[PDB]
Ligand binder design. Structure first.
Ligand SMILES: Nc1ncnc2c1ncn2[C@@H]1O[C@H](CO)[C@@H](O)[C@H]1O
Ligand SMILES: Nc1ncnc2c1ncn2[C@@H]1O[C@H](CO)[C@@H](O)[C@H]1O
Ligand SMILES: Cc1cn([C@H]2C[C@H](O)[C@@H](CO)O2)c(=O)[nH]c1=O
Ligand SMILES: Cc1cn([C@H]2C[C@H](O)[C@@H](CO)O2)c(=O)[nH]c1=O
Ligand SMILES: Cc1cn([C@H]2C[C@H](O)[C@@H](CO)O2)c(=O)[nH]c1=O
Ligand SMILES: [K+]
Ligand SMILES: [K+]
Lengths: 330, 330
């Protein structure tokens, strides 16, 4: 028996969510649909301009871990909060979902990371993230027994921003592979890819990462191309398995020369796209560690992602397992 | 001109919201549909048993003030938070809505009040409130110039639980009436009425409160009767104006011998009733301070209430002013 199906590792963040008009993004020089890193001063400035908000636990990998547990898989998470009220919210929410979460805060300062997420009328989300205590995640936070006893360890490209998180990830890759497990990453964001393109390619080509998640824009950014067919050909050459999401066009799963196209589910409306990619990874990795086919992995991914975009908040409030049973994916 | 249409005064609370099954309430001895006061230990305990949650600024009177501002009225609020992250959330949300809010925190202990609100499948809400910093609200928090410059000062029955808040309210009543303004209260909760029945009747009969809000169960509780018609007759005898809500049956406005019945909005699905009474008061008081007929005040209250119960969270995220325009209430 393996204690865990999926361990995820990421920036532990609490989301502060508000709807805005299109001009708000322009007026405030916020790059639409992207993750915009901000300092403490800018965080205070943007917050002062933000309307009344809602808070919900976030963090890309955090959401993925939660989604896996929701579907019924066994999940763990590494990510660093502060000993403050926001960190207590993050800690509660992830543990309440049944995710193993044992990363110890180092003190109250820097405070727990938060992301001000502005949702436009089209349902797109634009994130403004102060990393706070996420900068203290390092090799000391690697629970070696957890990595050794997890079928897949999945991590965010976003971890390349804080200074020492990469060292933790390299330790994870070593332990995971020594114990016959698989490593996975998400490219996270097209600008994050712009920042760490060479390093991400090295992770894939050195075999430190076995399974890569990307959306269309990230895959284009990885190879600095406008040719999507080139991007798919190259990503398939650079990693063992690639899962590439294409928004309303669903996704394509790649393994060597194999290609499996999956449709997006029918949706009422795009309420808020926050979490779509994360929950795609949840569905995929749940299916994968249940020994399902790559196509059914894609189907589970598209189901989980389709559900999350129909609600405010990055973690489905409804039962994904029930949804999966209802959709005949079981 | 008057600087403010409506000042509200209440327990400043951040809500922590989760959906639960019916049995959860029974297993944890939570009185359904009521405000259950809890101590710090019980707060920790219930939180440990609560699923993943969302946080949103709450507090009955806070919600009401926010509602008035959303409608286009000029609102102010008195309520005490702590110097902590929950308090910063509370402060941001209310100020961001355009409500004057200048109550100063006194320290970091007790921490900002929070209420764990469990929403059952029927849309009913059961609140479990640790008062925290609210126990510090007192006469020192009365901005006398604001009370003098507000057409109506409205407060919670809930304020009779913390020790010194009633002193602040008596100060408000004196100032309001000396400047020819009106005082209003809500009965808040039927168990709250059970606790403070005599005191609430005294507030009305002595003329300290001019306008009273009640729902059916509060009105029945106030006179310890099963006869709603008796409760209406008696409440009208006890205060100048009474606004009595009847859930899906709308509301009735009473003044002397005058009665004005108003229909409820027909509801698709009741998502979460949290805030319904609060937003009824927003609409009513907005209409009242705009010189509208009592019926129209009731219509505006029912409009705002119907809106809030169709969303998660106690403060409408949509434009109430726009909704009022569409409804010809303007
Ligand atoms: N720099 C970051 N690293 C990891 N996750 C992030 C970052 N910024 C925003 N997020 C999270 O991305 C999620 C949506 O993918 C949101 O819930 C938000 O918390
Ligand atoms: N003791 C209390 N005093 C004032 N408001 C409260 C109390 N308990 C819960 N609430 C608020 O009641 C609101 C719903 O009417 C919620 O937003 C919640 O914050
Ligand atoms: C219908 C739909 C699905 N999704 C799902 C399917 C994608 O593979 C996933 C990641 O974007 O989210 C959208 O993102 N947008 C949509 O409009
Ligand atoms: C006003 C205040 C009260 N308290 C304590 C004293 C009481 O035990 C409790 C309720 O007033 O809070 C503080 O710890 N710090 C403060 O600043
Ligand atoms: C419970 C409920 C309340 N309401 C509105 C009308 C009431 O006057 C107000 C307070 O309960 O909320 C509805 O419109 N429909 C409902 O089902
Ligand atoms: K969402
Ligand atoms: K609500």
């Amino acid at each position: 028996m393996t204690r865990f199906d999926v361990l995820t590792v990421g920036n532990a963040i609490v989301d502060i969510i508000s709807r805005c008009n299109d001009q708000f993004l322009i007026d405030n020089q916020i790059t639409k649909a992207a993750m915009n890193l901000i300092d403490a001063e800018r965080a205070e400035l943007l917050y002062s301009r933000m309307g009344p908000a809602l808070e919900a636990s976030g963090g890309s990998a955090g959401n993925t871990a939660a989604g896996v547990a929701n579907l019924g898989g066994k999940a763990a998470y590494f990510g660093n909060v502060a000993a403050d009220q926001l960190g207590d919210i993050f800690t509660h929410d992830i543990r309440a979902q049944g995710v193993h979460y044992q990363t110890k805060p180092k003190g109250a300062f820097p405070p727990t990371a938060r992301s001000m997420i502005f949702v436009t009328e089209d349902g797109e989300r634009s994130m403004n993230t102060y990393l706070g205590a996420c900068v203290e995640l390092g090799p000391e936070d690697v629970e070696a027994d957890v990595v050794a006893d997890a079928k897949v360890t999945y991590f965010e490209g976003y971890l390349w921003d804080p200074p020492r998180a990469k060292e933790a990830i390299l330790d994870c890759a070593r332990i995971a592979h020594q114990h016959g497990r698989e490593m996975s990453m998400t490219l996270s964001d097209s600008f994050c890819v712009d920042r760490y393109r060479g390093e991400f390619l090295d992770l894939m080509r050195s075999g430190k990462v076995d399974i890569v998640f990307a959306n269309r824009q990230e895959a284009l950014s990885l190879y600095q191309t406008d040719d999507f067919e080139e991007a798919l050909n190259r990503i398939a050459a650079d990693c063992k398995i690639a899962a590439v999401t294409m928004s309303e066009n669903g996704a394509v799963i790649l393994k060597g020369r194999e290609r499996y196209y999956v449709n997006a589910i029918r949706i009422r409306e795009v309420v808020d796209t926050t979490g779509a990619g994360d929950l795609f990874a949840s569905g995929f990795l749940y299916g994968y560690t249940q020994g399902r086919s790559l196509e059914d992995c894609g189907k589970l991914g598209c189901l989980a992602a389709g559900i999350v975009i129909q609600q405010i908040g990055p973690r489905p409030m409804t039962s994904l397992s029930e949804a999966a049973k209802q959709a005949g994916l079981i």
